[PDB]
Amino acid sequence: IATTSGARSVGLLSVGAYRPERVVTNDEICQHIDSSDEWIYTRTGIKTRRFAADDESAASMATEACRRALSNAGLSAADIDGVIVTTNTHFLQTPPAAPMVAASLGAKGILGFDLSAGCAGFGYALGAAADMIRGGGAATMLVVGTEKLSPTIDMYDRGNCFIFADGAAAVVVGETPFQGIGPTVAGSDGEQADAIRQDIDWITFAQNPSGPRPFVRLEGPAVFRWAAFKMGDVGRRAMDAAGVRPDQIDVFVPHQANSRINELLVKNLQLRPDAVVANDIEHTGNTSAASIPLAMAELLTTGAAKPGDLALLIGYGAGLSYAAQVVRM
Amino acid sequence: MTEIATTSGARSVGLLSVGAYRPERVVTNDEICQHIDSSDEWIYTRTGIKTRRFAADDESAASMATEACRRALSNAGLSAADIDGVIVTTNTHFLQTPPAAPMVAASLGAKGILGFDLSAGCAGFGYALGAAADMIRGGGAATMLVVGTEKLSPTIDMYDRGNCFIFADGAAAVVVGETPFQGIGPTVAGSDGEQADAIRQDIDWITFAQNPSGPRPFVRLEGPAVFRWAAFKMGDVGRRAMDAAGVRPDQIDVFVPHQANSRINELLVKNLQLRPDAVVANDIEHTGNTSAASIPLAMAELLTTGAAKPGDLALLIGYGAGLSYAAQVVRM
C-alpha cells in the first residue's frame, strides 16, 4: 500500500471572525436573575456577550467566518481542499454542518466533517487540519469554530446564565515557509464529564415533551478547579514540544472561560509581563469552540498582537477536554 | 529567528484489530410491519435486510462504544495503557455536549487521553480512520482507538414506510497503531452539501424544544436521491482510493461498502470490476444500516465468519448523510 506526504510546514494563513449584532448586557440576563451586575464582572470578567438572531445558526455563522477568513488570506473557496467545523451547537443529529458550509461557500464538493471536543474543539481541529495537510491529504483547509449556545441557556440558572454566547471565527491553514503550528498537546478527564453538560438528552425529552426542557449546566467550582491545577502544565508541554521557552511567547490566547483563571495561568505559565493576553471574553463571553479563534481575531484587529507574533493557545472545557499548541499569528 | 519544532513518527500504521458489539434485541421486518402496510418480502428485496438490532433503553452510543473498544482492545491483546487517543464517530449522541469521547475513554481506564467526537454522517468512520492515521504518522500519538457507534432506533419513525426498516443500532471499533508495513492507504473523501437534506433530522432540537406540543423530530431519507448519488458515484471514489493506495482493482480481496442498501452495493461491485472471487460485505442482512458504525461492523462479521482473513487487502467506502463519503484501502 502506497504512502503519501504533504507540506511538512503548515500554518495559520488568516483569521476570519463573525460576531452577532445583538449585544446582551448582564442587566439583560439579570432581569430574571438577582445576580448583581457588577459581581459577574469581577467574578468572571464578562461585561457583555453577543447573541445570534433566530434565523442564524451555528452553520450560517460558520460559513460567514470562512468568507472572511478567506478574504483575509486573500484566497478563494476554490483554494480550499477541506473544511473542519468544530461546534457543540448544531441542533441536528445529522447531517453535519461541514458539507453545508462547504456547498454554501462554493467549494460544494470538498471533503469535510464536524469536530466536537469540549470548548476545546478548535485546538483539536487545528491539530487535525495540520495533520491532514502534512499527510498529503489536503493542502489548504478551513477550520471553523461556531456556537449558538444562547438557545441552550436557562435564563434562571445563575451559574451558567452569564457564561455562554454565540459567535464564529475561522482560520485558513496551508503550506508555509516555516512551521507555523507546533505539535498538538491535548487530553481530558471524562471522570468529570458532568462539569459542563446538557442535563436531559434529546431523546428522553422527546418521549417526555410535557416534562422539562434541556439546558446546558456548568459546575464552575469544579471546571475552574481542574483548569487551575491542570492547564499551566499542558501549557508548558505545548511550549516544550514547540521547542520554546515561556519567555518567548508574545501572545497568550487561553480559553475565554474566566478572566481571573486566565490571569492565574499567566503567572503559572511564567510568561513575559509584556506578553499580550487575550481578554476578548469581556464583550463576547464564553463561546466554547469559537473562543480561541475569536480571541485571536480580536487581538489582531486592535493590533495588540501582530501577524508573526509567537502565540500559545490553550483551550479547555466541557466533557473535560483540552487542546493546546504554539503557533504564529 | 524563532524555530517552532516539527514533530513526526511512524510512517507505517495499520489496523491492529477490530472489536464489534451488536445489541441483543432482534427486530424483524414483520415487527415494523406492525405499523406499516409495506410488503415484508419487499423489504428484504429492495434493501437486502432480514433483521436489525435495537439497543436497550438503558444503552447509548457511548455505552456501546466502550463495549466495542473493550473488545477491539482485548482482540489486539492491548490495554488502555497502550492507547494514546480515541476518536468516537457517531450521529446519535443525544447531548449537545459533553462529547462522548473522554467519557468512553474514562470508562476504559484512560480518562486522561486525548479524544473527540467526529461526525461526517454515515461516512464518519472513514474520516475518523484517516484522522487517526494522520495524527499517528505526525507523532501526535502512537496507538489509537477509532469507534463507530449508532443508536438510531430512538430516531426512527415507526410509520415512515420510507426509512422505518433501514436504520439500526450498533458499534464496532478498531485499534490503530504502528505496523510492519503500511496497512492504511491515503484517505479519499468529499461531499455534496447540495443534497444535505437527502438523509436528515426533519426538525432541529431547539425548534422542537420551543414547541414541545408540536411535531417531534425524526430521521428522514430521500431514497431515490441517495440511490442515484451512491449507486453511480461511489465506483469513481473507490477507484481513487485504490489509485492513491497504488493498487489494482484485481488486487482487492475484500470489498466493504457502507451497508446502506443491497442493490446499491451490488451495483458498485459491478462498477468496480473486482476479481470474481473478491468477497463483499453483506453484513447488512442482519444488522441493517448502522451509519457511522457500518463498515467497522461489516469488517467484524466478515472476519469472525472467516469470509475474510487477517491481512486481506480490502477497499472501504463509506457514504451517507450530509452527503459525504470517505474511502481508503486497508489490510484487515
XYZ file of C-alpha atoms in Angstrom:
661
model
C 0.000 0.000 0.000
C 1.390 3.361 -1.086
C 2.272 6.186 1.332
C 1.881 9.881 0.561
C 3.018 13.126 2.164
C 2.309 16.842 2.007
C 3.946 20.091 3.107
C 5.612 19.440 6.453
C 5.384 23.157 7.252
C 1.812 24.394 7.630
C 0.450 27.459 9.347
C -2.444 29.783 10.051
C -2.756 31.938 6.945
C -5.571 34.093 8.310
C -8.426 34.534 10.749
C -11.990 35.459 9.925
C -14.381 36.347 12.702
C -18.118 36.816 12.875
C -19.810 38.235 15.947
C -23.648 38.598 16.041
C -25.164 42.080 16.146
C -27.275 41.806 19.306
C -25.363 42.909 22.406
C -26.578 41.366 25.657
C -25.697 43.189 28.845
C -25.644 41.422 32.207
C -28.593 43.546 33.287
C -30.405 41.931 30.380
C -29.886 38.435 31.800
C -30.097 39.994 35.281
C -33.815 40.658 34.788
C -34.875 37.121 35.676
C -31.880 36.636 37.972
C -30.766 38.626 41.018
C -27.073 38.042 40.325
C -25.610 41.527 40.846
C -24.426 43.021 37.542
C -21.051 44.195 38.828
C -20.470 40.889 40.668
C -20.497 38.870 37.446
C -17.825 41.140 36.002
C -15.457 40.950 38.923
C -16.118 37.203 39.210
C -15.916 36.089 35.546
C -14.586 39.153 33.707
C -17.615 39.476 31.438
C -19.446 42.752 30.716
C -21.397 41.856 27.564
C -21.995 38.986 25.132
C -23.362 38.694 21.588
C -26.427 36.649 20.678
C -27.256 35.455 17.182
C -30.660 36.120 15.608
C -33.342 33.442 15.287
C -32.656 32.985 11.570
C -28.966 32.334 12.219
C -27.400 29.014 13.144
C -24.032 27.563 14.061
C -23.723 26.798 10.360
C -24.705 30.193 8.882
C -22.227 31.911 11.224
C -19.627 29.277 10.349
C -19.772 29.934 6.616
C -19.691 33.678 7.235
C -16.500 33.440 9.292
C -14.961 31.414 6.457
C -15.977 34.024 3.909
C -13.898 36.482 5.948
C -11.061 34.149 6.852
C -10.934 33.533 3.100
C -10.822 37.201 2.168
C -8.131 37.901 4.785
C -5.913 35.159 3.402
C -6.641 36.675 0.007
C -7.934 33.303 -1.099
C -10.837 31.766 -2.964
C -13.193 28.976 -1.899
C -11.617 27.287 -4.890
C -8.331 27.215 -2.982
C -9.671 25.172 -0.036
C -9.315 21.358 -0.125
C -11.258 20.668 3.037
C -13.176 22.167 5.923
C -13.469 21.182 9.576
C -16.256 22.606 11.705
C -15.961 22.381 15.491
C -19.123 23.137 17.387
C -21.312 21.800 20.164
C -24.398 23.582 18.891
C -25.549 22.172 15.541
C -29.033 21.041 16.610
C -29.307 18.260 14.051
C -28.062 14.772 14.893
C -27.448 14.607 11.139
C -26.467 15.832 8.561
C -23.229 17.541 9.783
C -22.733 21.273 9.248
C -19.470 20.935 7.271
C -20.761 19.946 3.817
C -23.468 22.636 4.092
C -20.963 25.412 4.884
C -18.863 23.962 2.065
C -21.637 23.954 -0.564
C -22.609 27.317 0.861
C -19.088 28.661 0.216
C -18.919 27.371 -3.337
C -16.472 24.531 -2.656
C -19.546 22.262 -2.543
C -17.651 19.022 -3.196
C -14.655 19.335 -0.865
C -14.122 16.881 1.996
C -15.245 17.867 5.475
C -16.774 16.921 8.805
C -17.773 18.293 12.193
C -15.357 18.017 15.144
C -16.785 18.006 18.672
C -14.428 18.207 21.637
C -15.373 20.302 24.638
C -14.911 24.035 24.316
C -11.507 22.719 23.255
C -12.832 21.800 19.836
C -10.604 24.301 17.993
C -7.239 23.026 19.266
C -8.155 19.508 18.144
C -9.394 20.744 14.744
C -6.365 22.914 14.034
C -4.242 19.933 15.002
C -6.133 17.569 12.703
C -6.100 20.126 9.880
C -2.307 20.308 10.142
C -2.040 16.513 10.366
C -4.071 16.003 7.209
C -2.110 18.614 5.301
C 1.248 17.109 6.246
C -0.041 13.693 5.258
C -0.715 14.969 1.773
C -4.471 14.645 2.318
C -5.103 18.344 1.569
C -3.008 21.471 1.081
C -5.268 24.226 2.301
C -8.116 23.884 4.758
C -10.597 25.876 6.736
C -11.055 25.265 10.430
C -14.062 26.962 11.955
C -15.320 27.368 15.466
C -19.013 28.190 15.812
C -21.521 28.113 18.615
C -25.087 29.278 19.009
C -25.330 28.488 22.724
C -27.830 31.171 23.721
C -30.777 28.852 22.880
C -29.317 26.317 25.308
C -29.013 28.836 28.155
C -31.510 28.845 31.038
C -32.127 32.478 31.983
C -32.702 31.363 35.562
C -29.651 29.143 36.250
C -27.480 31.671 37.967
C -24.152 29.902 37.406
C -24.206 29.327 33.615
C -26.729 32.123 32.625
C -23.973 34.686 32.007
C -21.166 32.421 30.747
C -22.091 31.455 27.170
C -22.600 33.423 23.984
C -22.873 32.882 20.247
C -20.231 33.518 17.598
C -17.869 32.194 14.944
C -14.298 32.561 13.685
C -12.332 30.681 11.030
C -8.707 30.129 10.027
C -7.095 29.155 6.772
C -4.425 26.506 7.225
C -1.959 25.931 4.408
C 1.634 25.268 3.399
C 4.049 27.733 4.903
C 7.715 28.852 4.655
C 8.431 27.908 8.262
C 6.391 25.759 10.661
C 3.591 27.983 11.953
C 1.754 25.477 14.126
C 3.532 23.396 16.759
C 2.803 19.830 17.878
C -0.618 19.367 19.436
C -0.818 18.507 23.115
C -4.318 17.524 24.241
C -6.145 15.326 26.724
C -9.141 15.111 29.010
C -10.867 13.821 32.143
C -14.125 12.090 31.343
C -14.497 11.293 35.050
C -15.738 14.868 35.251
C -17.840 14.716 32.103
C -20.617 16.221 34.184
C -18.775 19.501 34.879
C -20.253 21.110 31.764
C -23.241 19.282 30.308
C -26.706 19.274 28.830
C -28.935 17.932 31.635
C -31.536 15.976 29.610
C -30.644 14.121 26.394
C -32.945 14.984 23.494
C -34.468 11.512 23.199
C -35.551 11.387 26.835
C -37.020 14.838 26.249
C -38.817 13.797 23.059
C -40.517 10.943 24.914
C -41.368 13.388 27.706
C -42.241 16.664 25.831
C -44.640 17.715 28.565
C -41.791 17.408 31.052
C -38.704 19.671 31.451
C -36.589 21.218 28.729
C -32.834 20.580 28.271
C -30.323 23.327 29.225
C -26.544 23.466 29.495
C -25.418 23.366 33.112
C -21.965 24.432 34.288
C -20.319 23.400 37.587
C -17.793 26.225 37.703
C -16.120 25.387 41.008
C -15.042 22.056 39.529
C -14.203 23.118 35.953
C -12.144 26.049 37.170
C -10.603 23.936 39.917
C -9.389 21.494 37.246
C -8.273 24.303 34.935
C -6.226 25.986 37.647
C -4.088 22.963 38.500
C -4.016 21.356 35.086
C -3.749 23.936 32.311
C -0.452 25.520 33.363
C 1.221 22.180 32.764
C -0.496 21.385 29.484
C 0.721 24.887 28.652
C 4.369 24.086 29.389
C 4.112 20.836 27.450
C 2.758 22.732 24.449
C 5.678 25.189 24.571
C 8.078 22.380 25.362
C 7.022 20.443 22.261
C 7.253 23.532 20.076
C 10.831 23.961 21.265
C 10.201 27.257 23.055
C 10.760 28.812 26.472
C 7.992 30.514 28.482
C 9.753 33.822 27.813
C 9.481 33.555 24.034
C 5.722 33.619 23.575
C 4.402 37.099 22.625
C 0.679 36.438 22.808
C -1.222 34.079 25.091
C -4.674 33.054 23.982
C -6.208 30.855 26.677
C -9.849 29.858 26.501
C -12.092 32.816 27.342
C -13.698 30.883 30.185
C -12.874 33.100 33.159
C -10.624 36.190 33.340
C -9.378 35.500 36.836
C -8.311 31.962 35.965
C -6.618 33.190 32.803
C -4.577 35.572 34.958
C -3.529 32.792 37.334
C -2.390 30.865 34.273
C -0.306 33.821 33.113
C 1.711 33.598 36.305
C 1.991 29.854 36.420
C 2.964 29.725 32.747
C 5.597 32.349 33.632
C 5.183 34.481 30.532
C 6.690 37.931 29.985
C 4.789 40.735 31.717
C 4.506 42.464 28.329
C 3.054 39.339 26.715
C -0.353 40.258 25.265
C -3.201 38.246 26.744
C -6.494 37.630 25.001
C -9.328 39.169 27.068
C -11.971 39.185 24.330
C -14.087 37.426 26.950
C -15.094 40.885 28.201
C -17.596 41.692 25.481
C -18.174 38.242 23.959
C -18.220 35.866 26.915
C -17.575 32.142 26.511
C -18.140 30.827 23.007
C -16.920 27.276 23.581
C -15.428 26.020 20.270
C -15.199 29.555 18.830
C -13.488 31.141 21.877
C -9.844 30.929 20.842
C -10.389 31.755 17.145
C -12.342 34.828 18.185
C -9.752 35.644 20.887
C -7.007 35.731 18.256
C -9.083 37.710 15.771
C -9.870 40.244 18.487
C -6.160 40.641 19.303
C -5.280 41.289 15.681
C -7.913 43.919 14.787
C -6.690 46.019 17.722
C -3.105 45.429 16.642
C -2.497 44.275 20.207
C -0.930 41.236 18.579
C 0.788 41.325 15.214
C 0.962 38.735 12.439
C 4.061 36.653 13.046
C 3.777 37.005 16.819
C 4.515 33.817 18.725
C 1.305 32.622 20.435
C 0.364 29.943 22.966
C -3.143 28.567 22.543
C -4.863 26.763 25.424
C -8.423 25.509 25.127
C -10.316 23.728 27.918
C -13.954 22.889 28.592
C -16.941 20.536 28.673
C -16.621 16.756 28.919
C -13.415 17.967 30.378
C -11.159 18.047 27.401
C -8.317 20.367 26.443
C -6.043 21.065 23.489
C -3.016 23.286 23.358
C -0.352 24.271 20.823
C 2.102 27.011 19.920
C 1.602 28.960 16.681
C 2.387 32.132 14.732
C -0.466 34.591 14.270
C 14.752 33.842 14.373
C 12.093 31.692 16.077
C 12.094 27.954 15.330
C 8.853 26.123 16.060
C 9.668 22.415 16.263
C 8.299 19.926 13.745
C 7.152 16.600 15.140
C 6.824 13.193 13.500
C 6.949 9.462 13.984
C 5.854 6.164 12.430
C 5.073 6.280 8.730
C 3.738 2.740 8.732
C 0.408 2.228 10.518
C -2.488 -0.209 10.336
C -5.467 -1.996 11.845
C -4.148 -3.945 14.801
C -7.620 -5.324 15.479
C -11.398 -4.975 15.254
C -13.979 -5.194 18.005
C -17.724 -5.251 17.486
C -20.775 -5.071 19.674
C -24.270 -5.624 18.393
C -27.298 -5.114 20.734
C -29.297 -8.100 21.969
C -32.763 -7.264 20.647
C -33.512 -8.614 17.177
C -36.180 -6.550 15.432
C -37.655 -8.165 12.329
C -39.199 -6.697 9.216
C -42.553 -8.093 10.351
C -42.277 -6.165 13.613
C -42.083 -2.722 11.999
C -44.718 -4.127 9.618
C -46.978 -3.772 12.637
C -47.338 -0.081 11.820
C -46.642 -0.233 8.067
C -48.621 -1.823 5.217
C -45.439 -2.214 3.175
C -44.606 -5.663 1.767
C -42.401 -7.757 4.080
C -40.549 -9.628 1.342
C -40.418 -6.287 -0.491
C -38.182 -5.075 2.315
C -35.587 -7.825 2.005
C -35.715 -7.439 -1.767
C -35.414 -3.642 -2.046
C -32.794 -3.435 0.699
C -31.432 -6.892 1.492
C -32.318 -6.609 5.170
C -33.857 -9.515 7.050
C -33.374 -8.284 10.616
C -31.643 -5.500 12.597
C -30.574 -4.959 16.225
C -32.043 -2.376 18.600
C -30.158 -1.444 21.755
C -31.953 -1.232 25.104
C -33.355 1.923 26.672
C -30.515 1.992 29.173
C -27.947 1.841 26.353
C -26.375 4.719 24.461
C -23.935 5.398 21.649
C -21.432 5.972 24.476
C -22.124 2.764 26.379
C -21.928 0.656 23.197
C -18.744 2.388 22.073
C -16.874 1.490 25.230
C -18.084 -2.104 24.966
C -16.755 -2.225 21.402
C -13.406 -0.677 22.407
C -13.024 -3.214 25.198
C -13.406 -5.953 22.659
C -11.348 -4.174 19.980
C -8.745 -3.732 22.716
C -8.956 -7.282 24.003
C -8.529 -8.658 20.480
C -5.347 -6.663 19.902
C -4.017 -8.041 23.155
C -3.659 -4.467 24.392
C -4.860 -2.277 27.241
C -5.945 1.352 27.625
C -2.430 1.880 28.905
C -1.337 1.290 25.290
C -3.746 3.729 23.631
C -2.813 7.390 23.303
C -6.079 8.652 21.943
C -9.601 7.632 20.981
C -11.997 9.068 18.378
C -15.719 8.449 18.566
C -17.684 8.710 15.317
C -21.443 8.917 15.634
C -24.582 10.855 14.761
C -26.554 9.587 17.734
C -25.093 11.096 20.885
C -28.127 12.973 22.124
C -26.238 15.622 24.120
C -25.010 18.842 22.532
C -22.122 18.471 24.968
C -20.109 16.955 26.614
C -18.617 14.865 23.766
C -18.824 11.115 24.229
C -15.057 10.628 23.838
C -13.480 11.462 27.214
C -16.487 9.735 28.800
C -15.887 6.455 26.961
C -12.156 6.856 27.498
C -12.626 7.273 31.252
C -14.785 4.151 31.006
C -11.745 2.174 29.818
C -9.252 3.306 32.437
C -7.579 6.031 30.379
C -9.539 9.122 31.463
C -6.607 11.407 30.647
C -6.071 10.515 26.990
C -6.969 12.809 24.134
C -10.134 12.224 22.194
C -13.017 13.910 20.437
C -16.263 13.191 18.625
C -16.323 13.390 14.816
C -19.470 13.438 12.731
C -19.387 13.025 8.951
C -22.765 11.384 8.508
C -22.717 7.659 7.662
C -19.140 8.124 6.458
C -17.670 9.295 9.754
C -15.637 6.116 10.177
C -13.605 6.668 7.022
C -12.843 10.199 8.146
C -12.131 9.083 11.715
C -9.860 6.342 10.407
C -7.965 8.853 8.272
C -7.521 11.415 11.050
C -6.251 8.770 13.481
C -3.844 7.616 10.786
C -2.705 11.203 10.116
C -2.204 12.017 13.793
C -0.051 8.956 14.395
C 2.192 9.499 11.386
C 2.523 13.035 12.682
C 3.800 11.932 16.074
C 0.768 13.280 17.913
C 0.043 9.724 19.050
C 1.392 6.175 18.695
C -1.699 3.972 19.006
C -5.355 4.903 18.811
C -8.933 3.829 19.138
C -11.492 4.623 16.472
C -15.078 3.723 17.375
C -18.254 3.703 15.337
C -21.482 3.870 17.387
C -25.052 4.463 16.493
C -28.337 4.212 18.375
C -30.719 5.317 15.667
C -33.717 3.311 16.988
C -34.933 6.281 19.053
C -34.863 8.395 15.910
C -36.895 6.130 13.608
C -40.494 6.918 12.736
C -42.380 3.631 13.073
C -44.848 4.911 10.497
C -42.325 6.023 7.902
C -42.612 3.455 5.111
C -39.536 5.145 3.697
C -36.934 4.551 6.409
C -38.560 2.602 9.272
C -36.867 -0.614 8.051
C -33.424 0.835 7.168
C -31.670 2.110 10.322
C -30.339 0.163 13.301
C -28.099 0.318 16.395
C -24.582 -0.985 16.934
C -20.903 -0.312 17.492
C -17.553 -1.609 16.242
C -14.083 -0.181 16.885
C -10.519 -0.636 15.691
C -7.141 -0.303 17.317
C -4.910 1.752 15.036
C -1.153 1.635 15.540
C 2.333 1.162 14.150
C 2.725 -1.758 11.781
C 5.485 -3.703 9.924
C 4.246 -2.166 6.679
C 1.557 0.322 5.660
C -1.861 -1.032 6.471
C -3.885 2.099 5.742
C -3.772 3.806 2.363
C -4.262 7.529 1.674
C -7.696 8.898 2.510
C -10.025 9.890 -0.310
C -13.092 11.913 0.721
C -15.569 14.580 -0.256
C -19.210 15.601 -0.192
C -22.263 17.155 -1.818
C -23.711 19.616 0.668
C -26.230 20.485 -2.047
C -28.067 17.328 -1.138
C -27.703 17.908 2.605
C -31.390 17.019 3.014
C -31.024 13.560 1.381
C -30.715 11.958 4.815
C -31.551 14.141 7.790
C -33.369 15.009 11.009
C -36.500 16.844 9.804
C -36.653 19.313 12.764
C -33.841 20.769 14.890
C -33.809 20.270 18.654
C -34.136 23.905 19.646
C -37.200 24.364 17.415
C -38.764 21.287 18.952
C -37.824 22.368 22.480
C -39.676 25.637 21.870
C -42.742 23.790 20.606
C -42.950 20.529 22.638
C -46.678 20.335 21.929
C -45.875 20.106 18.223
C -44.020 17.527 15.998
C -41.132 15.501 17.410
C -38.041 15.178 15.176
C -37.229 12.015 13.190
C -34.680 10.902 10.609
C -35.907 11.180 7.047
C -34.378 9.703 3.919
C -34.994 10.648 0.286
C -34.423 7.166 -1.046
C -34.063 7.823 -4.793
C -31.643 10.744 -4.348
C -29.304 8.687 -2.167
C -29.541 5.759 -4.543
C -28.757 7.906 -7.536
C -25.885 9.521 -5.706
C -24.172 6.470 -4.169
C -25.023 3.955 -6.877
C -23.396 5.985 -9.665
C -20.620 7.903 -7.967
C -19.011 5.681 -5.344
C -17.415 3.488 -8.026
C -15.341 6.517 -9.038
C -14.252 7.229 -5.467
C -13.370 3.585 -4.973
C -11.017 3.916 -7.914
C -9.452 6.974 -6.321
C -8.826 5.045 -3.139
C -7.031 2.232 -4.937
C -5.099 4.627 -7.153
C -3.983 6.650 -4.143
C -3.179 3.346 -2.440
C -1.192 2.325 -5.513
C -3.179 -0.834 -6.142
C -5.239 -2.545 -8.852
C -8.939 -3.441 -8.647
C -7.954 -7.067 -9.219
C -5.821 -6.841 -6.093
C -8.510 -6.136 -3.518
C -9.524 -9.325 -1.764
C -12.460 -7.907 0.169
C -14.802 -5.052 -0.674
C -16.598 -3.362 2.235
C -19.070 -0.714 1.028
C -21.227 1.075 3.553
C -24.043 -1.367 4.331
C -26.650 1.116 3.132
C -28.555 -0.906 0.546
C -28.003 -4.267 -1.183
C -28.996 -3.143 -4.647
C -26.675 -0.119 -4.360
C -23.684 -2.195 -3.304
C -24.378 -4.885 -5.873
C -24.088 -2.115 -8.460
C -20.786 -0.844 -7.045
C -19.346 -4.369 -7.078
C -20.119 -4.381 -10.776
C -18.867 -0.862 -11.448
C -15.617 -1.674 -9.614
C -14.853 -4.868 -11.538
C -13.214 -6.880 -8.764
C -11.855 -10.422 -9.082
C -14.931 -12.674 -9.296
C -13.673 -14.338 -6.102
C -13.428 -10.990 -4.300
C -15.539 -11.134 -1.100
C -18.064 -8.404 -0.382
C -19.530 -7.301 2.954
C -23.172 -8.365 3.229
C -23.424 -7.677 6.942
C -26.488 -5.532 6.181
C -28.707 -8.618 6.129
C -28.841 -8.998 9.905
C -27.820 -5.568 11.179
C -29.244 -3.099 8.661
C -27.783 0.387 8.201
C -25.885 1.335 11.340
C -24.495 4.584 9.923
C -21.056 5.514 11.347
C -20.587 2.007 12.727
C -21.420 0.355 9.418
C -18.146 -0.625 7.769
C -16.360 -1.369 11.090
C -19.160 -3.826 11.943
C -19.199 -5.338 8.446
C -15.482 -5.974 8.961
C -16.030 -7.801 12.234
C -18.662 -10.021 10.594
C -16.521 -10.849 7.554
C -13.602 -11.610 9.872
C -15.448 -13.618 12.529
C -17.255 -15.717 9.900
C -13.983 -16.386 8.132
C -15.198 -14.815 4.891
C -12.116 -12.595 5.169
C -8.735 -13.380 6.731
C -6.366 -11.056 8.628
C -4.112 -9.408 6.085
C -6.569 -9.415 3.211
C -6.435 -6.222 1.160
C -9.846 -4.571 1.442
C -11.440 -1.468 -0.011
C -13.673 0.501 2.370
C -16.206 3.009 1.025
C -18.313 4.995 3.450
C -21.186 7.103 2.136
C -24.318 8.752 3.515
C -25.767 11.735 5.413
C -24.807 15.359 4.726
C -23.857 13.588 1.576
C -20.283 12.876 2.412
C -18.064 9.932 1.636
C -14.737 8.649 2.782
C -12.829 5.728 1.370
C -9.436 4.116 1.765
C -7.702 0.797 1.217
C -6.512 -1.162 4.261
C -5.222 -4.559 5.276
C -7.760 -6.310 7.576
